């Protein structure tokens, strides 16, 4: 008995199957992250990714920024997080402009790990990525606003 | 088989390892909320102009209207000027 | 670094990094549109010379002016 097996039974594809790669917990959890929901409108997946990251980014900027000890304005350091979301929404935007063209189809795989044919994820399409950037921006600024909305009764505010 | 000149996506491993392909877990109403309020942001060209100009004007506002209580560069020197090694 | 270490080491290192990106979830949704390669041998000599010269000029300009203007004499 052995634990490490070739990637999907093919030894000549550059990868391996390990508990980190191929495991029911890892496979399910990654299959349930919004970036891997290959049948959902990319606008909504962008909303979730934007909400999670915009919410997370507020913490470090507020607690480590220059105005951190000047409590008069340190709570407004979420603006820096919001500015990074703006910058990242530009990085996301300019990425799709160069990667996918208007009439180009999806570059995502049109297969399944079991061989059956599949409908490619619309995220690797020009309009799909545009919806994801718009969703990430909307959820991003919403995540920063909602994170700054909370401030009190926390051990590290 | 693993080598099939017909389908090279299966031959070269062009698979979706962690794609779910399941229907949406996001219920309705909520999705329509985001699909109508995040609608104008999904034009990548318009979003690019909106981000650059909007972000640049936001940066210009908070920089032009800065405060001496927040930035030492605007507060300026509060002490009398020093004296150079020989000159002023 | 650009003048002592040479290319082939960094090319094999970039190959091990390209495999890492293609096999990492979430990030593999982002594809590079230009293949990552190590800097050319002539490019390495130029980049190393430019860092050498910039450091040369800036180090001495800093010492020159600070040691002279600090005394002004």
């Amino acid at each position: 008995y052995q634990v490490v097996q070739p990637i999907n039974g093919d030894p000549f594809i550059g990868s391996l199957e390990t508990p980190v790669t191929s495991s029911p917990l890892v496979a399910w959890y990654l299959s349930n992250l919004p970036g891997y929901r290959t049948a959902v409108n990319p606008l909504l997946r962008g909303i979730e990714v934007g909400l999670a990251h915009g919410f997370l980014l507020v913490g470090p900027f507020v607690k480590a920024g220059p105005l951190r000890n000047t409590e008069i304005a340190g709570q407004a350091g979420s603006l820096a997080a919001g500015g990074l979301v703006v910058i990242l929404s530009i990085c996301l935007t300019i990425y799709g402009i160069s990667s996918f063209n208007e009439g180009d189809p999806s570059t995502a795989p049109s297969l399944t790990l079991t061989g059956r044919k599949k409908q490619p994820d619309q995220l690797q399409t020009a309009d799909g990525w545009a919806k994801f950037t718009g969703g990430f921006f909307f959820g991003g600024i919403s995540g920063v606003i909602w994170a700054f909305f909370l401030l009190y009764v926390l051990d590290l505010p | 088989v693993y080598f099939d000149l017909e389908d090279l996506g299966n031959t070269t491993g062009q698979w979706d390892l962690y794609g779910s392909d399941a229907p949406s877990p996001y219920n309705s109403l909520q999705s329509k909320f985001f699909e109508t309020f995040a609608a104008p942001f999904t034009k990548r060209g318009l979003l690019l102009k909106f981000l650059i100009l909007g972000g640049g004007s936001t940066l210009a506002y908070f920089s032009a209207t800065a405060s001496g209580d927040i930035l030492p560069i605007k507060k300026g020197p509060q002490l009398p000027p020093q004296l150079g090694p020989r000159l002023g | 670094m650009f003048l002592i270490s040479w290319r082939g080491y960094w090319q094999e290192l970039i190959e091990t990094l390209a495999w890492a990106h293609e096999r990492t979830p979430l990030a593999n949704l982002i594809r590079w549109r230009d293949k990552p390669v190590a800097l050319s041998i002539v490019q390495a000599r130029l980049v190393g010379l430019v860092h050498f010269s910039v450091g040369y000029i800036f180090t001495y300009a800093a010492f020159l002016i600070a040691s002279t203007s600090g005394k002004f004499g």
């Binding site: 300019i94 160069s98 | 210009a60 | 230009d34």
Partner: peptide, 30 residues
């Protein structure tokens, strides 16, 4: 007051627009 407008306009906005536009031109195809 003018530095408070032009210093970010050349150290933040200008490199942002310049790097993004050069990225689009370099990665463009015909």
């Amino acid at each position: 007051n003018l530095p408070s407008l032009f210093v970010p306009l050349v150290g933040l906005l200008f490199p942002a627009v310049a790097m993004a536009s050069l990225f689009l031109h370099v990665e463009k195809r015909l």
